[PDB]
Design a protein around this motif. Sequence first.
Motif, PDB file in Angstrom:
ATOM      1  N   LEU A 122       0.962  -1.223   0.091  1.00  0.00           N
ATOM      2  CA  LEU A 122       0.006  -0.021   0.076  1.00  0.00           C
ATOM      3  C   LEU A 122       0.677   1.107  -0.167  1.00  0.00           C
ATOM      4  N   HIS A 123       0.464   2.350   0.142  1.00  0.00           N
ATOM      5  CA  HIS A 123       1.015   3.674   0.115  1.00  0.00           C
ATOM      6  C   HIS A 123       0.508   4.767   1.227  1.00  0.00           C
ATOM      7  N   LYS A 124       1.471   5.051   2.117  1.00  0.00           N
ATOM      8  CA  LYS A 124       1.033   6.272   3.198  1.00  0.00           C
ATOM      9  C   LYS A 124       0.964   7.369   2.436  1.00  0.00           C
ATOM     10  N   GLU A 125      -0.091   8.218   3.107  1.00  0.00           N
ATOM     11  CA  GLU A 125      -0.674   9.557   2.379  1.00  0.00           C
ATOM     12  C   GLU A 125      -0.603  10.681   3.660  1.00  0.00           C
ATOM     13  N   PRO A 126      -0.278  11.605   3.317  1.00  0.00           N
ATOM     14  CA  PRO A 126      -0.588  12.699   4.282  1.00  0.00           C
ATOM     15  C   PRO A 126      -1.930  12.993   4.864  1.00  0.00           C
ATOM     16  N   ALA A 127      -1.885  13.407   6.118  1.00  0.00           N
ATOM     17  CA  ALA A 127      -3.287  14.039   6.709  1.00  0.00           C
ATOM     18  C   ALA A 127      -2.727  14.833   7.844  1.00  0.00           C
ATOM     19  N   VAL A 160      -2.177  10.567  18.490  1.00  0.00           N
ATOM     20  CA  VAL A 160      -2.239  11.555  17.322  1.00  0.00           C
ATOM     21  C   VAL A 160      -2.194  13.100  17.518  1.00  0.00           C
ATOM     22  N   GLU A 161      -2.253  13.481  18.686  1.00  0.00           N
ATOM     23  CA  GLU A 161      -1.926  14.711  19.277  1.00  0.00           C
ATOM     24  C   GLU A 161      -0.422  14.971  19.271  1.00  0.00           C
ATOM     25  N   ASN A 162       0.311  14.119  19.700  1.00  0.00           N
ATOM     26  CA  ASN A 162       1.807  14.292  19.936  1.00  0.00           C
ATOM     27  C   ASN A 162       2.668  14.039  18.582  1.00  0.00           C
ATOM     28  N   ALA A 163       2.176  13.391  17.864  1.00  0.00           N
ATOM     29  CA  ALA A 163       2.717  13.220  16.552  1.00  0.00           C
ATOM     30  C   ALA A 163       2.874  14.320  15.790  1.00  0.00           C
ATOM     31  N   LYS A 164       4.102  14.496  15.277  1.00  0.00           N
ATOM     32  CA  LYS A 164       4.602  15.494  14.375  1.00  0.00           C
ATOM     33  C   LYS A 164       4.061  15.151  13.011  1.00  0.00           C
ATOM     34  N   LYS A 165       3.810  14.275  12.676  1.00  0.00           N
ATOM     35  CA  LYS A 165       3.485  13.777  11.247  1.00  0.00           C
ATOM     36  C   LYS A 165       2.376  12.474  11.382  1.00  0.00           C
ATOM     37  N   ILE A 166       1.313  12.969  10.878  1.00  0.00           N
ATOM     38  CA  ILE A 166      -0.154  11.794  10.667  1.00  0.00           C
ATOM     39  C   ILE A 166      -0.151  11.409   9.064  1.00  0.00           C
ATOM     40  N   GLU A 167       0.078  10.246   8.991  1.00  0.00           N
ATOM     41  CA  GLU A 167      -0.202   9.527   7.649  1.00  0.00           C
ATOM     42  C   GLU A 167      -1.550   8.609   7.744  1.00  0.00           C
ATOM     43  N   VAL A 168      -2.017   8.483   6.647  1.00  0.00           N
ATOM     44  CA  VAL A 168      -3.226   7.607   6.202  1.00  0.00           C
ATOM     45  C   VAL A 168      -2.877   6.799   5.371  1.00  0.00           C
ATOM     46  N   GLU A 169      -3.398   5.357   5.495  1.00  0.00           N
ATOM     47  CA  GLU A 169      -3.235   4.376   4.619  1.00  0.00           C
ATOM     48  C   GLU A 169      -4.497   3.560   4.198  1.00  0.00           C
ATOM     49  N   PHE A 170      -4.999   3.662   3.186  1.00  0.00           N
ATOM     50  CA  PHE A 170      -6.011   2.764   2.739  1.00  0.00           C
ATOM     51  C   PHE A 170      -5.398   1.432   2.252  1.00  0.00           C
ATOM     52  N   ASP A 171      -6.245   0.359   2.281  1.00  0.00           N
ATOM     53  CA  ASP A 171      -5.954  -0.911   2.132  1.00  0.00           C
ATOM     54  C   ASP A 171      -6.512  -1.116   0.344  1.00  0.00           C
ATOM     55  N   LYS A 172      -6.779  -2.320   0.212  1.00  0.00           N
ATOM     56  CA  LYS A 172      -7.241  -2.698  -1.316  1.00  0.00           C
ATOM     57  C   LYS A 172      -8.600  -2.957  -1.418  1.00  0.00           C
ATOM     58  N   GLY A 173      -9.398  -2.957  -0.182  1.00  0.00           N
ATOM     59  CA  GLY A 173     -10.956  -3.213  -0.332  1.00  0.00           C
ATOM     60  C   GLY A 173     -11.599  -1.580  -0.156  1.00  0.00           C
ATOM     61  N   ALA A 175     -11.024  -7.146  15.059  1.00  0.00           N
ATOM     62  CA  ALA A 175     -12.441  -7.224  14.429  1.00  0.00           C
ATOM     63  C   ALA A 175     -12.637  -6.614  13.135  1.00  0.00           C
ATOM     64  N   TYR A 176     -13.741  -6.876  12.743  1.00  0.00           N
ATOM     65  CA  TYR A 176     -14.318  -6.200  11.454  1.00  0.00           C
ATOM     66  C   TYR A 176     -13.416  -6.498  10.280  1.00  0.00           C
ATOM     67  N   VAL A 177     -13.078  -7.686  10.105  1.00  0.00           N
ATOM     68  CA  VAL A 177     -12.022  -8.121   8.983  1.00  0.00           C
ATOM     69  C   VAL A 177     -12.815  -8.604   7.670  1.00  0.00           C
ATOM     70  N   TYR A 178     -12.754  -7.505   6.935  1.00  0.00           N
ATOM     71  CA  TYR A 178     -13.439  -7.629   5.511  1.00  0.00           C
ATOM     72  C   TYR A 178     -12.246  -8.157   4.421  1.00  0.00           C
ATOM     73  N   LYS A 179     -12.691  -8.854   3.325  1.00  0.00           N
ATOM     74  CA  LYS A 179     -11.736  -8.981   2.083  1.00  0.00           C
ATOM     75  C   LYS A 179     -11.663  -7.640   1.637  1.00  0.00           C
ATOM     76  N   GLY A 180     -10.348  -7.680   1.133  1.00  0.00           N
ATOM     77  CA  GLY A 180      -9.740  -6.468   0.586  1.00  0.00           C
ATOM     78  C   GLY A 180      -9.044  -5.623   1.542  1.00  0.00           C
ATOM     79  N   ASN A 181      -9.407  -5.419   2.865  1.00  0.00           N
ATOM     80  CA  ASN A 181      -8.940  -4.589   3.772  1.00  0.00           C
ATOM     81  C   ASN A 181      -8.231  -5.288   4.954  1.00  0.00           C
ATOM     82  N   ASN A 182      -7.835  -6.696   4.750  1.00  0.00           N
ATOM     83  CA  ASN A 182      -7.142  -7.402   5.695  1.00  0.00           C
ATOM     84  C   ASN A 182      -5.713  -7.515   5.528  1.00  0.00           C
ATOM     85  N   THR A 183      -4.956  -6.553   4.896  1.00  0.00           N
ATOM     86  CA  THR A 183      -3.388  -6.579   4.774  1.00  0.00           C
ATOM     87  C   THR A 183      -2.796  -6.814   6.030  1.00  0.00           C
TER      88      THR A 183
END
Length: 129
Positions: free
Chosen positions: A1-6, A54-67, A100-108
């Motif tokens: 996958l790839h990390k993205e800024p937020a 999240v608050e003490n992080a200098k850098k927040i990144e988001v990563e979507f999966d394949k589902g 919990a909440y294990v769906y196909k696509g999003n289980n990397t």
Amino acid sequence: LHKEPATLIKAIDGDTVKLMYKGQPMTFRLLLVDTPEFNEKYGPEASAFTKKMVENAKKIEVEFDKGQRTDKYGRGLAEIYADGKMVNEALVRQGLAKVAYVYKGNNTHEQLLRKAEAQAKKEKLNIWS
Ligand SMILES: Cc1cn([C@H]2C[C@H](OP(=O)(O)O)[C@@H](COP(=O)(O)O)O2)c(=O)[nH]c1=O
Ligand SMILES: [Ca+2]
């Protein structure tokens, strides 16, 4: 996958956070986990743990999966990283989230999260005590 800024807008509870992504406000629900609701046992503790992260992080990144990228409630479905550290795995490893909440696509990172869960369980941490 790839990390993205937020950028953090505000913490919400153990497994939801409101971030600015692609310049827009968006609620993100952590993939593959379930933290207690605030009104439940270890709810305040999971909420505070995430908020800290999240608050003490200098850098927040988001990563979507394949589902699926967005849930039925319009919530972004992602791994959130705080200075390179995955918040999803962090909660599980300290026993503040169940896998919990294990769906196909999003289980990397499903097996990665399960590892952290066994370890919290053996150490009888929070939820597992
Ligand atoms: C984590 C996750 C939740 N959801 C939905 C299913 C659940 O619906 P229901 O609300 O109908 O039970 C809800 C659980 O989230 P919460 O744990 O935030 O309540 O969010 C997804 O659709 N995909 C996901 O990856
Ligand atoms: Ca929850």
